[PDB]
Design a protein around this ligand. Structure first.
Ligand SMILES: NS(=O)(=O)c1cccc2ccccc12
Ligand code: NA
Ligand SMILES: [Zn+2]
Length: 257
């Protein structure tokens, strides 16, 4: 039922997922002036050297690149985190136009897209248990602006034609997610939620200050995907982003400045 249209989009979600109006929903506007620098925050540790990608899937909301998370191979730790979190999948949110697409905003600025690298806390043993816990997930968010191409994104863009419609998947081995990272790992962090249903409040958000640049042709290829299944009327996969939600009783911390 849920999606991103006029009849089933974010403003509808609370009727099936009442936690939509909860106390720690994501995304949020990052007010850079009122984020608190925390000199006690550690550098983020991204260990993606042994990442094993398996498959790329159109799930009718976005596309996910999924990883083997049955051993410590690609993990996030340090930063604001206490445990080790294993990479399970990444996906993106993007706009119909270059002026929108990101979920988090920075002083109300919207980027063309946002990458989410989703990781789960290994003390909970698997992803399904982790989403049930307030510290179960860590999502590393990276903004995309349109400019020069990102060469490390091209293998992704080039397979999209093979998973055009909802439910299609393709083998996707040997993809290296390190090729999607900006140079700096300076970040903001705050406790929040999944940004799609079921909107569970299990996420430590870590959002990088530095965006990556992708080319207009790269983002154009994202916009050719389809929300609909094969042999249904074409609905282009665009504007699959949830708007900023009330910060409520939360402080965004910054690792820098
Ligand atoms: N948009 S997102 O909040 O990164 C997100 C999308 C889909 C599933 C997720 C599972 C766990 C954590 C986050 C997830
Ligand atoms: Na294994
Ligand atoms: Zn996401």
């Amino acid at each position: 039922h849920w999606g991103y249209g006029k009849h089933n989009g974010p403003e509808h979600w609370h009727k099936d997922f009442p936690i939509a109006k909860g106390e720690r929903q994501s995304p949020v506007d990052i007010d850079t002036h009122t984020a608190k620098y925390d000199p006690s925050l550690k550098p983020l540790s991204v260990s993606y050297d042994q990442a094993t990608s398996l498959r790329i899937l159109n799930n009718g909301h976005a596309f996910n690149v999924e990883f083997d998370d049955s051993q410590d191979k690609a993990v996030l730790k340090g930063g604001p985190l206490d445990g080790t979190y294993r990479l399970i999948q990444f996906h993106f949110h993007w706009g119909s136009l270059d002026g929108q697409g990101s979920e988090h905003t920075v002083d109300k600025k919207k980027y063309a897209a946002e990458l989410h690298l989703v990781h789960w806390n290994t003390k909970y043993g698997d992803f399904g248990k982790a989403v049930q816990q307030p510290d179960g997930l860590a999502v590393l968010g990276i903004f995309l602006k349109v400019g020069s191409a990102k060469p490390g994104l091209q293998k992704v863009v080039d397979v999209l034609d093979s998973i055009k419609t909802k439910g299609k998947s393709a083998d996707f081995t040997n993809f290296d997610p390190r090729g999607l990272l900006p140079e700096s790992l300076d970040y903001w962090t705050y406790p929040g939620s999944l940004t799609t249903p079921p909107l569970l409040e299990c996420v430590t958000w870590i959002v990088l200050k530095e965006p990556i640049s992708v080319s207009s042709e790269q983002v154009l290829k994202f916009r050719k995907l389809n929300f609909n299944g094969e042999g249904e009327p074409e609905e282009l996969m665009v504007d699959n982003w949830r708007p900023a939600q009330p910060l409520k009783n939360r402080q965004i911390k910054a690792s820098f400045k």
